[PDB]
Every structure is written in structure tokens, then in C-alpha cells.
Amino acid sequence: VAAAAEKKSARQKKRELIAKRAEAYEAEYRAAEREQIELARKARAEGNYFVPHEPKLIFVVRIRGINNIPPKARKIMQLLRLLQINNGIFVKFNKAIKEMLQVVEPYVTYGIPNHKTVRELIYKRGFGKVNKQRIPLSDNAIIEAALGKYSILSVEDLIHEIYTVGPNFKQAANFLWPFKLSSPLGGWRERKFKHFIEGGDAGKRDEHINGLVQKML
Amino acid sequence: ALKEYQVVGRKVPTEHEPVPKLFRMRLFAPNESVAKSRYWYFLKMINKVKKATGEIVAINEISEPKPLKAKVFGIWIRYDSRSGTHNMYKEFRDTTRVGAVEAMYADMAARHRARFRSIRILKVVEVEKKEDVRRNYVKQLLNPHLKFPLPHRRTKKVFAPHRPSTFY
Amino acid sequence: AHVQKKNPLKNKAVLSRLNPYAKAYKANVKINSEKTPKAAGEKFLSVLHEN
């Protein structure tokens, strides 16, 4: 009766802890979205202009193959872990990253995702790098073993650590394997290898990357 | 389809310019990002303000205030021609400012084999006085007793049994 | 262990495994009502309907 009993109870209390944590994160998302709406409405009413928020999280998708690519760009591909077409990885949008991206501007597409695409990816296409092995995230215990040092104990905690760009964003990459996405349903645009502004599909695309993922995913 | 955006932008605040002036222009883009990109290109070419030194303070899609009132629009554009310098002014009649711009773009690609790249729209203006309308085709449209036969009626089920009426 | 990978998005039993929170998540919430406070600044209309 014993031994397994205390394990079950500790297992149980951990289950409410992640439940309490998940409640806290969901309230954080909704409050953040609400103040976005309210501070936009207030500024638009009294008259002064509200300004967007410089984003720290973007999603990157490699859209060209492995043939006929300059050595400078394929080197960046290796440093980004984008070693295959239709892959995908997260990168902390900063001056170093932003200036890095224009080098591979025609070879990747990037933009700022919101909470849904992060949640869908991890749940569905989320494969964790456990012991240098692409181990799927089918259990919370898998994430606990590899991120218990950083107090991440479930998928939802990982989703918040990713989506809100926590300090352990760097300490979560090598836990997580690149998103090996499928070819997008409905297709790309007619001419895929032009810049997104020019009627193509490469480059920074912002609010119109969420669309892409839903297809690719 | 195109959509009309007002974009307000300015350069980054600094000691040199603690309160830079807001610069707003209305420009037509199919999406948000194209509007911002066209804004930066326009401001760089006109006022000589760098993309890096600036930032967008407001972008708002503008709907048609009266999307059911037949209106006549005059469009001044600066076409980039084989010499890269040419000016134009075309008249259009429709219900939505975006419609006139969209029709103008197809008109450019047809009668001058132009791109979205080479076209720079100066000003789109609503013209209300009839005698202020210049072009012949639109003016003859404005007459009160308009009437004409259905132009180009043109009308799987292969192998139809009877000869088409193709008339009234 | 883990012969087959199952999506939480499609298999509801796998959500209950991953989220001990999907039990009560309550997606849709009345935060508007009959009382909508239409608020667009008067000069904002002026600058919008400008040029």
C-alpha cells in the first residue's frame, strides 16, 4: 500500500500545481490582450496615438531547399537549425537576430505568431530533444526530466515559457527539436521565391504568417 | 483585393529631434505589411528619412464612407516609364475609392504594360461638379437618360440540342 | 513506451493527460453586453476623413 501511495499523492499535488500554474498563465494572456485593447481604445478616444510593441518572439520557416545556396547563407541555416525545407524554429527577435535574418531573407519567411500557433505546434508537432534524440512530448514527465532545473513541469509551462519569452527561452531550445512541417495545404503563392511584399512568399510577413502555419502544420 | 490604409509615421525620438513631426499619408496596399513597406519607401524617397531611424505610430484601414453612392474619382499618378519620368491623370466612376484604384491599376497594366512597382499614386480626389469632369467617356455617362443594349451578352452540358437564342 | 503518437488536438483523452486544466477552461466569456461604449475620438474622425 505504501511507497506507491506517497508517489501517487506527490504525483497528485504536482497535477494541481500545473493546473494552478496554467490558470495563472491563461489569466496573464487574457489580461495582456485586454490591456492591448483598452490602451488602444483610450488612445484613439482622447486623441494621442498608441504605438505597437516591439516583439521579442518570431517564428521562422525555411522555404528553399538545400541546393544552390551561397556558403554565407547555408552557414546561417546551420546556426538557425534550419537544415531542411519547410522546417521551422523560434528565434528571440533582437538586433543580432534581426540583422542576421536579412542575410537569408529570400530563403526564409518570418513573422510574429500569437498564442494559438505556439500551442498547436507543441501539442501536435512538438518533438522534444531528449538525450540527443527526437522524443515526442506525449507526457508531462518528459518535459519535467529535461526542464525541472528551470521549474518547467508541463507542456503548458513550456508554452508560456516560449510564447511570453521567459529567461529560459535559450534553456528550452535544445530541449525542443525543429518543427518539421508539411507542405502547406492550398499551396504557396503563385511565385514563391519573391519577397512577401512583392507578391512572393519569402521574407518578413507579420500578421500573415499565422495563416501560413495553419496550412503548413 | 486592395484596401486603403492611412499610415502615420515618424523618426525615432532623440536629442536632435525630441518630438519629431508625425507624417501621415493614405496609400493603397493589399495588406498591412505592404502598406508599411510602401510608406517607408515613400518617406525615404520624398523627405529622406531612413527606415532604421523611423517607426510606425498608427496604421488604420479606411472603409468607404458611402459605398453605395455612385461617385467619380480623378487620379493623378507619376508613372515610371522607359525614361522613368511620366505624369498621368485618369478619370473613373464607381462606388468605392479602392475600386477606382484597382480599376486604375488594371488600366495601367493594359494600356501601358505597367507594374505595381512603377506606379506612384499622387492623389485620389472625389469630383462632384459635373462640369468639372474632363474625360469624354465619363461625361457622356453622366447624361440623365442613359440607356443602352446589354453590351457583350455572350449568353458543363456539352452538345446543347437547340441553337442558342443569344438575343432577347 | 509510446508506440504511437496521438494529437491532443484530436484525441480528447490525451488533453486530459497533458492538461489537468481543460476540464474547466470556459473559452467564451461575456465581456461585452447591450451596453457597448462606442469610442472614437472626434479629431480622430477629422484626421481619418482628411485629404
Binding site: Y49, H53 | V19, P20, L22, M25, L43, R78 | -
Partner: peptide, 16 residues
């Protein structure tokens, strides 16, 4: 994010 003055310098129309 922050706030962006508009009263002091009302936006001015720009054309190519």
C-alpha cells in the same frame, strides 16, 4: 509600448 504625441504636432499629409 508607449505613447506617441499627436496634439503638439498634428499629422501632416504627404504625397509623392
Amino acid at each position: 509600448a508607449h505613447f506617441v504625441s499627436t496634439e503638439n504636432n498634428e499629422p501632416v499629409t504627404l504625397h509623392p
